[PDB]
Amino acid sequence: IVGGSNAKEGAWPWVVGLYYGGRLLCGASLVSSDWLVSAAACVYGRNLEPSKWTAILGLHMKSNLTSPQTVPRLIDEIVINPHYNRRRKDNAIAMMHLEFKVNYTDYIQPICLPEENQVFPPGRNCSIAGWGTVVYQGTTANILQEADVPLLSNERCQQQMPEYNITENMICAGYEEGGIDSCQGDAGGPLMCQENNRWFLAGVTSFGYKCALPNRPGVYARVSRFTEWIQSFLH
Amino acid sequence: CGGPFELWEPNTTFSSTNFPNSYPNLAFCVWILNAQKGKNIQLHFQEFDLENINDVVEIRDGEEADSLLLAVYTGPGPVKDVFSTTNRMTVLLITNDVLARGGFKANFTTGYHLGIPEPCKADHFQCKNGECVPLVNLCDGHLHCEDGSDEADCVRFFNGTTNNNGLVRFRIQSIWHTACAENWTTQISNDVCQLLGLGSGNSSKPIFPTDGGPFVKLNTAPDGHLILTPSQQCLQDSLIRLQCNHKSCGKKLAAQDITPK
Ligand SMILES: *[C@@H]1O[C@H](CO)[C@@H](O)[C@H](O)[C@H]1NC(C)=O
Ligand SMILES: *[C@@H]1O[C@H](CO)[C@@H](O)[C@H](O)[C@H]1NC(C)=O
Ligand SMILES: *[C@@H]1O[C@H](CO)[C@@H](O)[C@H](O)[C@H]1NC(C)=O
Ligand SMILES: *[C@@H]1O[C@H](CO)[C@@H](O)[C@H](O)[C@H]1NC(C)=O
Ligand SMILES: *[C@@H]1O[C@H](CO)[C@@H](O)[C@H](O)[C@H]1NC(C)=O
Ligand SMILES: *[C@@H]1O[C@H](CO)[C@@H](O)[C@H](O)[C@H]1NC(C)=O
Ligand SMILES: *[C@@H]1O[C@H](CO)[C@@H](O)[C@H](O)[C@H]1NC(C)=O
Ligand SMILES: *[C@@H]1O[C@H](CO)[C@@H](O)[C@H](O)[C@H]1NC(C)=O
Ligand SMILES: *[C@@H]1O[C@H](CO)[C@@H](O)[C@H](O)[C@H]1NC(C)=O
């Protein structure tokens, strides 16, 4: 996210950052007490050594890490989606198992998965989270930047994104005139869309052609087509 | 970009492009290892030493346009073997343009059920890790099979179209069946809610006895685990139409304020 605002501490407890050997690479959305969900575009080629990965749960400010709300955890298993394809950029999701269980604290809460036969209508105002990068050719922000991003249709996204074959398993979301879109360093950011006083997981930040560009939105992985696949690992 | 291609049964041992020297950068090779119908593929590696995440081997199992994935190997070390399912194991190599490594080798000998251990028949339940447990851990409350398949979900719903609704369909060890609500309380209600991965019981009430299956008698005890007994002695049985709400999902639990600015 480029044009994001500072989020209140605790407003998004199900948004964590994945550290790869002491360095933040991509974000993940905690779904269960032991299984996370992140974009497969970052764990691709790194799942062989799960001990190197480490996920900080309930993290809000990287500099303010000494707070007891941040519970560190170690990764021991990474499961990439079988239908993944790095060239076509299709089904870029991958779950990550935790070593030990974690208690649901005030700043750590699980996210809700989208049920089957439940389509999100386009033009729906609902924001995202994650360590968004403020400037394309620069560095990210220490605070959890966030901003509202409306949902678009697949046909309009295909008309605006002819470089990539937009299939049914992908959903786009971005401003028509650009300015505020997900950028580098925030792959795997959840597309949290509120439904009946409850937030769901309506998309995972897969990739982006050019962030903060007009008519160039970001393509997100449609999680509603992988509900049972994710639920098969939650137990 | 123009290396080897599909092989067959006799030709087994092959390097990527050049074993004694390093592979050229920006190369995208492919080795579509095939076999006869009904035969699986094996991809044991005798030598493997590649670069970091920038250089990987996207081992595919497509056989069609909808390709699957089996393993993504990279870096040095004796990587584990790959055991495909179909008779067409596609091997795609993706390399960077900096610090090219030597290469690797692969000896693919086809066969039947390679890698996957042979399941034991004659009343031997095989959990998803290959271990065999005939009746010692058939959904009884133990974790012998470390993958959790021995204590897997032996419970489900019936005519429960939505997520957290349905009947009280219960499987003791082998056969699925309903239960009874003669001693049904909110305690066992929230217990079976949690066992089904749900929240708390909202409103539990029966409708009518539908089938005469071997219903189970649910009971309560301070030992934690629920007492069950599939006795077929119950007149006008009350099939539980469980209405359990969802668990604590992604709702704001903190004490946030209202500052719309
Ligand atoms: C967080 O920041 C506050 C003030 O900026 C500081 O006093 C505190 O030591 C920091 N770390 C915590 C609370 O763990
Ligand atoms: C979680 O709660 C349990 C009791 O339910 C307690 O024993 C444990 O210390 C708590 N914290 C963790 C990290 O498990
Ligand atoms: C969505 O939010 C933007 C600003 O965040 C606002 O301009 C727009 O009117 C909103 N749309 C709806 C339907 O609420
Ligand atoms: C996308 O893929 C489908 C399936 O092969 C194909 O029919 C279609 O022409 C492709 N579209 C583009 C724009 O590549
Ligand atoms: C095996 O390799 C040889 C040598 O290039 C080639 O002539 C032959 O067609 C290959 N396939 C076989 C023998 O099935
Ligand atoms: C392939 O060759 C290696 C070389 O030692 C041998 O160990 C192996 O049994 C052969 N067959 C395979 C890997 O199926
Ligand atoms: C469930 O629906 C099926 C529809 O074929 C019906 O036959 C059956 O009697 C129903 N059972 C209950 C308990 O409603
Ligand atoms: C179950 O209910 C019946 C009828 O009220 C009663 O006689 C019996 O003692 C109850 N059993 C238990 C274990 O509560
Ligand atoms: C039961 O469901 C109703 C739906 O209208 C809801 O209002 C109520 O809060 C629920 N009660 C519990 C205990 O979940």
Residue numbers in the entry:
A (entry chain B): 785 to 1019
B (entry chain A): 524 to 784
The article reads:
Human enteropeptidase (hEP), also known as enterokinase, is an essential enzyme in food digestion and is localized at the brush border of the duodenal and jejunal mucosa. Activated hEP can stimulate the conversion of trypsinogen to trypsin via cleavage of a specific trypsinogen activation peptide, namely Asp-Asp-Asp-Asp-Lys (DDDDK), which is highly conserved in vertebrates. However, the mechanism of hEP activation remains to be established. hEP contains a multi-domain heavy chain and a catalytic light chain, linked by a disulfide bond. The functions of these domains and motifs may be involved in protein anchoring, macromolecular substrate recognition and inhibitor specificity. The light chain is homologous to trypsin-like serine proteinases with a typical Asp-His-Ser (D-H-S) catalytic triad responsible for peptidase activity.
We mutated all three residues to Ala (namely hEPmut) and observed the abolished proteolytic activity even in the active state. Notably, native gel analysis showed a reduced shift of the mutated hEP core (hEPmut-core) compared to the wild-type hEP core (hEPwt-core) upon activation, likely caused by a change in charge. To investigate the influence of charge on the catalytic pocket arrangement, we determined the active hEPmut-core structure at a resolution of 3.7 Å. The overall architectures and the catalytic triads of active hEPmut, and hEPwt cores were quite similar, with an r.m.s. deviation of 0.799 Å, indicating that mutation of the catalytic triad abolished the catalytic activity without changing the catalytic pocket. In conclusion, our study revealed an activation mechanism of hEP involving a flipping of the IVGG loop to stabilize the surface loops around the catalytic sites; our results also suggested the surface charge provided by the catalytic triad to have no effect on hEP activation, but it may affect the catalytic substrate reaction by reducing substrate binding affinity. However, the active hEPmut alone can generate a normal hEP map, showing an overall shape equivalent to that of the active hEPwt with a well-organized catalytic pocket.
